[PDB]
Amino acid sequence: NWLGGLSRAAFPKRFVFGTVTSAYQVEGMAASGGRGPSIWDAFAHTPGNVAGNQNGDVATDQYHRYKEDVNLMKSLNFDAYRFSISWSRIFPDGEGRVNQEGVAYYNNLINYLLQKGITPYVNLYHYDLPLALEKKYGGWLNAKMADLFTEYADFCFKTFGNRVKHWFTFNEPRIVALLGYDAGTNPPKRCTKCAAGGNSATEPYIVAHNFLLSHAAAVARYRTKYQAAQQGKVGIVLDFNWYEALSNSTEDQAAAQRARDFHIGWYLDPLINGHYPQIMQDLVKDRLPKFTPEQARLVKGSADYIGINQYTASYMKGQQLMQQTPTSYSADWQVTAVFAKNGKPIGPQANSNWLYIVPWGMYGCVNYIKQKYGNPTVVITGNGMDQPANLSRDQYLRDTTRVHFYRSYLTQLKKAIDEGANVAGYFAWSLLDNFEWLSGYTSKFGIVYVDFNTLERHPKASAYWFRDMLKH
Ligand SMILES: OC[C@H]1O[C@@H](O[C@H]2[C@H](O)[C@@H](O)[C@H](O[C@H]3[C@H](O)[C@@H](O)[C@H](O[C@H]4[C@H](O)[C@@H](O)[C@H](O)O[C@@H]4CO)O[C@@H]3CO)O[C@@H]2CO)[C@H](O)[C@@H](O)[C@@H]1O
Ligand SMILES: OC[C@H]1O[C@@H](O[C@H]2[C@H](O)[C@@H](O)[C@H](O[C@H]3[C@H](O)[C@@H](O)[C@H](O[C@H]4[C@H](O)[C@@H](O)[C@H](O)O[C@@H]4CO)O[C@@H]3CO)O[C@@H]2CO)[C@H](O)[C@@H](O)[C@@H]1O
Ligand SMILES: [Zn+2]
């Protein structure tokens, strides 16, 4: 059957199914309703930065159309909606004055979701640092971010936490560190060679450390001030793509494990065990910041659940570990990514070149977290694939590749859960075609088609696949 035996009965009792967006990618009204600019507004308005010089000024205009979009998700039988609050829509300068019109928007959204029986899962941060904070403080390079983020988080807990019971602090701090401070291809565009300055060998580590410390500080504030009354939870969202040893050799097996440690262990070892992975300590040395005992104790156990964004997988080939002049976080791993084994590609690619369709990667990742980290509560916070630009409306709607993607990936997730993985929920990226960062509107991840000329929504075949799979 097109559901392939999947339904709510195939997953644990009370398992949560939702869709996910982020503020800058869907809201629009980027310079309206009192919102201050984010680093992404400045970046996207710079000629050459985004495909077609596009930006999120209008995006999907969810700001005006949110009731349509909530009605749609309810009609598709989802239980939950993961979205983010734009920091600069609440605090246009990142600190100080509150934008009441911004607060009203999120109140209206949260209330409508609850009216329609959809549980809000709310991210505080999704790449969209207030521009004012980047300029005044130097953003995530500055340890003062812990204080600034905590004050913002405190405001959100106070204002929305009587209703919102499932929070996430950050979305994929690894991607911020990698693209913003190693490769320098995302804001603030820092890297060793970059015009804005930087150092690809040091700054990604500083940035990651500050995300961990900021997460821990915000969670300590939630736990000491709000949790008794509100009785909600706070986690973090981490990207994790699967790495499989290219062969059963010692060097290849070591390579795959080293890659896992630099990718996900970078954050999970601090969050679960209170230290960075040993291999990062051994290889990165003085360039890896050291947690004080007090900080490690604040960071350890500071996530109520681990959000995982899971998309893809690759093979890893190793070599002899060697002494080398530091150049970048990326080069520090001393591995080679490989996308074919025994002459056959690991999987076909979706529209994004990095996204190889490999359903067994989902099992790989979930099983690995279960076995390595004491089976913490995991939520799959994003999973999906993209269509290319320039298709007809009907071609977008007939998304048979995406239907196959979800059926296969969800079957692999079911396999891991049936083997005992503590997975509490799953969220499809995305509800809607949206602004896909550097790809702008050239990459379509939605289960619902958005016509970017008229802004009309049209559910794709994959949306009706979910509706059928999720009927109560
Ligand atoms: O309906 C509005 C909209 O829907 C869009 O999507 C369609 C799909 O294109 C179409 O293939 C799909 O058909 C499903 C059907 O809904 C299921 O009920 C059926 O499931 C069977 C299964 O085949 C058996 O093996 C199993 O044992 O029993 C079940 C249930 O009895 O499977 C077929 C797929 O072959 O339905 C979607 C939603 O209607 C259309 O693309 C669009 O044109 C429509 O406007
Ligand atoms: O994208 C959909 C949606 O989900 C989330 O998107 C994240 C993904 O979770 C994350 O895995 C993805 O990471 C990509 C990254 O964008 C690429 O730039 C990077 O490219 C590599 C390249 O493949 C290598 O050949 C080269 O050596 O290095 C570069 C890195 O400089 O590859 C990774 C995957 O391995 O990033 C997505 C966001 O950009 C987000 O939560 C959501 O907002 C997205 O819309
Ligand atoms: Zn509008």
Swiss-Prot record:
Its EC number is 3.2.1.21. GO terms for biological process: carbohydrate metabolic process. The active site is at 172 (proton donor), 382 (nucleophile). GO terms for cellular component: extracellular region. It is an enzyme of class 3 (hydrolase). It catalyses: Hydrolysis of terminal, non-reducing beta-D-glucosyl residues with release of beta-D-glucose. Changing residue 186 to H: Decreases KM for substrate about 2-fold. It is found in: Secreted. Glycans are attached at residues 248, 390. One of its GO terms (molecular function) is prunasin beta-glucosidase activity. Disulfide bonds join 191-194. A beta-D-glucoside binds at residues 25, 126, 171-172, 311, 382, 429, 436-437, 445. Its main location: secreted. Belongs to the glycosyl hydrolase 1 family. Homodimer. Hydrolyzes p-nitrophenyl beta-D-glucoside, p-nitrophenyl beta-D-mannoside, p-nitrophenyl beta-D-galactoside, p-nitrophenyl beta-D-xyloside, p-nitrophenyl beta-D-fucoside, p-nitrophenyl beta-L-arabinoside, oligosaccharides, pyridoxine beta-D-glucoside and the cyanogenic glucosides amygdalin, prunasin and dhurrin. Possesses pyridoxine transglucosylation activity. This is Beta-glucosidase 7. The lineage of its organism: Eukaryota, Viridiplantae, Streptophyta, Embryophyta, Tracheophyta.
